[PDB]
Amino acid sequence: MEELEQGLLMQPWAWLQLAENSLLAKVFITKQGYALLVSDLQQVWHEQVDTSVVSQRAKELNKRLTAPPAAFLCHLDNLLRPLLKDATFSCDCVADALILRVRSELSGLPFYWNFHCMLASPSLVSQHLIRPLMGMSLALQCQVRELATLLHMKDLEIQDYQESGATLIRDRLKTEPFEENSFLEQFMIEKLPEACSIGDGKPFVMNLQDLYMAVTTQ
Amino acid sequence: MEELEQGLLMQPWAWLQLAENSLLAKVFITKQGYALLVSDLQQVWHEQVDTSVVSQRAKELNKRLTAPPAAFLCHLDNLLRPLLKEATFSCDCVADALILRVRSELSGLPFYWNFHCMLASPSLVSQHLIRPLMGMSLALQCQVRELATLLHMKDLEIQDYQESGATLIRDRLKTEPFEENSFLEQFMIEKLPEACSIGDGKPFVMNLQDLYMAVTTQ
Amino acid sequence: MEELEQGLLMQPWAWLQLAENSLLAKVFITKQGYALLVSDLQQVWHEQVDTSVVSQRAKELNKRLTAPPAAFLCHLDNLLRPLLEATFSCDCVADALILRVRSELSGLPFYWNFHCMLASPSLVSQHLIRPLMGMSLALQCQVRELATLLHMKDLEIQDYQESGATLIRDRLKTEPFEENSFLEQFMIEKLPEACSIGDGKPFVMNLQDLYMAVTTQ
Amino acid sequence: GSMEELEQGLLMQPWAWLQLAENSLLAKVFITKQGYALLVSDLQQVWHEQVDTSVVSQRAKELNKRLTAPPAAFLCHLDNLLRPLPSEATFSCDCVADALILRVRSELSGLPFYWNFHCMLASPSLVSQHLIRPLMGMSLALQCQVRELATLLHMKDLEIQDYQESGATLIRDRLKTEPFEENSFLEQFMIEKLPEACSIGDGKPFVMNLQDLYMAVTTQ
């Protein structure tokens, strides 16, 4: 199985909906089993599973049916685009275990399942949650660096103009000369308060989750 | 007691080293007890202490050094201060707990303390560790954003100097129009590999502490 | 599981060595798990355990490997059956003692990390003290039976050297046994040495029969 | 006064048997005008407390309304108590968490005398110092003595054996002892004597037979 963890890392995070709460997570599925990582912005849960249990519990909660593994896993695969595919979702918190129940209808015919979660190992939170985040920070910094230098280059062209003249056209459209500090200070006053919106990680997932994808495989 | 935890959330992160193992952490000290949060990237540790244990344990590494409680933390805090912002360090770990080894001097004399930390609380690895970082990341995205729009504006200006004013430039300071996607890509190919490089947590501290607190206090 | 403790008490103590430090301990092993008891003569350390964790940490480190736990416990059962032989190292942090055992086992590497907590007091009783106390008093009683025996032979030659009217070759003419003077001469000349802890060696060598016989008692 | 100073001695102090309502603990105690050192147990767990003048004065004034007084005085008072070895004495003891509380009440000029003793569990190091090491040592030494008795016994044997193979006989036909056997003594003793002898009980057969040796092994 094991390599699922691999794939898990490669997979990005996203946003979901529930009655008491609403969580983030990433997941990977093969015809062998699954790997799962959820979190409510305070604590992190995780579960890996093989055939045996898939089958057993599968039959348990589904008095109705009786399928094989493969299909099964594949069907959870059909959690269509994070939001919004069209499937009902419920969540319960008890013990060091997050129970996560699910209802869907493959061919106008209801299906019932539930996830047994424990609290995620520290090391794991370090692989999926911490290190990659920090990396994102540093990198982003560098990006801002190259953008600053580009800004000042442009500034050196338009300043190769300004002294020897030319006069422009739509007088106003010229932007102020670039200062690197007098920007970081009016950014960490005007724009920083909301720039770091924890909220519910929903802001993170887009831009930031993509850059994350960029990060993990590294 | 409470206050301790409080102050801790303020104090940023820095670099160390002992037996070569290099750890990072945050610490808060006032008379009455300290707040400690260590980590070796891939496991978090933590220890909160009041007067009682200072007194008890402090005379067990020094079976004769009978001292006032609130004086210990005076010294400790004082050396940690010159190091981060005369000593000897070591570190060991087993099972669930990290034992930190402070083998220093005071003045001409020897002093010996042992930190008994245990895997840091989940909610702490939440408040101290992640939420803040995610914030740094979203905010940085904001910075690359505004730097992008400004780059495009300067672009409109230089392209009002180089088309409408019908003038020319020395061609040595002639920059290419800014393409944020071509940028992001060329950078995530050429510069991405190691910009994020965690290292020993060192590239992190020196570079992004200002922001760490720019978000962790907010 | 519970039986591990019974057999554990059923076992005498022995000596070891690992990177200069030299611990003492007792242990018991059946196919479920084991029960262990290590100490350096100041604080005692203790770890009881089953199959779950022997397979878990029997994992961490030794990755590649995959086996039934009852095989592990058997392996080490062979290692430590006759260390009482690959190598060892000992680490000490927190309340705990981490015991690193390194060995081959038919080719491929393989080693374990005993996670030791600080022994339960009640245990220190069951195994350590009570038994020891018993040993002491027993030895005393031996000293008394031996006292009366000695005085009895003294009676025999005190019937040969007066009432029989005979003399000796005086090469084997021994002294009238005084219990008290013997106690002082021994507690001045022989006591400073007869009660030598040192490393716990003079114990496992001279008293494991008394101990084993008293803890089954 | 480096407190511990106490401890020390404490050691060159020996145990001794008590009695209470539900239990009958053992312990050892050391008292100077500075403070005191205390080590109790019921044969299952070990307890300990060392106290400085201050707390003595405080807690002491608490429990005792009737009177009040100086630090030193108090401590003096306590050393007044032998252990029959026959006078007043009222004892009790109750266990909470792992820090048992020992209740005392006695005369002292018709103004009785109460106390709240505060015993925690004894750090390992210590239960090794007072308890383990000295005990094991005892074991060893006693072994040795049994040895010297084996050799002395065999000496007597050689004497009577150069007496009975060369012309001497008994007057009282009954003082004829047996040659000697160490192995047989150890076995007959280990089936006919061991099951008694080695009896824990109330720590009583201990402080009444092996005290001198204990101390001799705690001072050395």
Partner: protein, 140 residues
């Protein structure tokens, strides 16, 4: 350059007798290239000395004991005893060669194999080698 080959039993198709060629320079430790083919298709991979000493350190065996076991595991230089067992997923490349002995299954190594685009050429290759090999071997 040098070479040696052996027959194995993939524990995915214990009926189809797959085959394994191994080619190197001087000592097997000087890096080596490996090939596994069933007759129809053909897989190949590269394991440098770097990862020989790397896996040798990972297991904690000397570099010379690990090289011995990899000269009894991938050069059919296995004694009459040891029960090695190889494993390949034709879907996940990762071919891991495990050892098995006395109720305990372990392992011994694992590598990433590619899928050559011309199985045929490689086959005619090995074959030719064998030809010249028995010609020159009945020449000795």
């Amino acid at each position: 350059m040098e070479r040696k080959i052996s027959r194995i039993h993939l524990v995915s198709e214990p009926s189809i007798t797959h085959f394994l060629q191994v080619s190197w320079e001087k000592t097997l430790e000087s890096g080596f290239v490996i090939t596994l083919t069933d007759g129809h298709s053909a897989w190949t991979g590269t394991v440098s000395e770097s990862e020989i000493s790397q896996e040798a350190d990972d297991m904690a065996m000397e570099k010379g004991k690990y090289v011995g076991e990899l000269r009894k595991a991938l050069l059919s230089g296995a004694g009459p005893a040891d029960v090695y067992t190889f494993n390949f997923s034709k879907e996940s490349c990762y071919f891991f060669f495990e050892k098995n002995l006395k109720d305990v299954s372990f392992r011994l190594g694992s590598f990433n194999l590619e899928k050559v685009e011309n199985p045929a050429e490689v086959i005619r290759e090995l074959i030719c080698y064998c030809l010249d090999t028995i010609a020159e071997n009945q020449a000795k």
